[PDB]
Amino acid sequence: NHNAQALNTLVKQLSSKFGAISSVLNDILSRLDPPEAEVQIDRLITGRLQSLQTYVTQQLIRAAEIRASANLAATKMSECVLGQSKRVDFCGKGYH
């Protein structure tokens, strides 16, 4: 659900104007001169790139969490399935 909601938020951030007159690039390209549309396209690109960088940072944090959880799961496998771990509460409650 976190991945799905992150994708939905990233695809929704395109609806933002970031101070521009409109969020649609085609509208700005249609009813503005290139020298007058550049000042809006720059802000749109800045906002979308900031959204992308925030999404990439969140995905990197989630990937670090997933790497930690996967290392933990591999340790659980190697110590409980492939062997008999003596660590208390590592392979479930009670004598594993």
């Binding site: 991945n3 994708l7 990233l10 395109l14 690039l25 085609n26 390209l29 290139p34 550049e38 396209i41 720059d42 690109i45 979308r48 790139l49 992308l52 960088q53 999404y55 995905q59 989630r62 990937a63 997933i66 959880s69 996967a70 933990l72 799961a73 659980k76 479930g92 409650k93 009670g94």
Partner: protein, 207 residues
């Protein structure tokens, strides 16, 4: 020369808007015990924000404190179960909110009846208080979460306990291993297949 300023009467201890020689803001005014210097006019704390000001008509000093506020947290069970909800004014006293109003250490809770008994924490409220939705006649009841069942070990100098039987049990442990691979077309996401947009995006480097 700016013409007549037309000051008004001073009002204290109330949530009003204040203006002192151009400095505007919103907050209450209370008699302070500070020792402002004769030439100093504005009072500022460590956080680089105004907390006091000198009145222009009288040299007395008054503290500046914004009106009461706080987060509004709503406690509700599943929608398919009931429609009654509870409101939690965290960080705000109950006397400052304006039948079952209760004051917790985490904030003022309205809409939940406090009980002396304790159960497992269903909905974490804060400061050790948790709320459940129970038929006490269903209502949201507030209570102190119980840490566990009361038990005492019969310790002694020569008493030992040894089990005569055992029960094999299986416990499931869920651990994530991976997630969905995200691939984002940066040029197509930022720019809707436009040429001038792509040329302007190329100016931002290798982001």
């Amino acid at each position: 020369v700016c013409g007549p300023k037309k000051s008004t009467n001073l009002v204290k201890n109330k949530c009003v808007n204040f203006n002192f020689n151009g400095l505007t803001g919103t907050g209450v005014l209370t008699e302070s015990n500070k020792k402002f210097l004769p030439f100093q006019q504005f009072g500022r704390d460590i956080a680089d924000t105004t907390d006091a000001v000198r009145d222009p008509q009288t040299l007395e000093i008054l503290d500046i404190t914004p009106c009461s506020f706080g987060g509004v947290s709503v406690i509700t069970p599943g929608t398919n179960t009931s429609n009654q909800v509870a409101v939690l004014y965290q960080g705000v006293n109950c006397t400052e909110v304006p039948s079952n109003v209760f004051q917790t250490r985490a904030g003022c809770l309205i809409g939940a009846e406090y009980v002396n008994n304790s159960y497992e924490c269903d909905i974490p409220i804060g400061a050790g208080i948790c709320a459940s939705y129970q038929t006490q006649s269903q209502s949201i009841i507030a209570y102190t979460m119980s840490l566990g069942a009361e038990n005492s070990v019969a310790y002694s100098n020569n008493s030992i306990a040894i089990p005569t039987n055992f029960t094999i049990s299986v416990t499931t442990e869920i651990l994530p291993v991976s997630m969905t691979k995200t691939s984002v077309d940066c040029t197509m996401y930022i720019c809707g297949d436009s040429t001038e947009c792509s040329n302007l995006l190329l100016q931002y480097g290798s982001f």
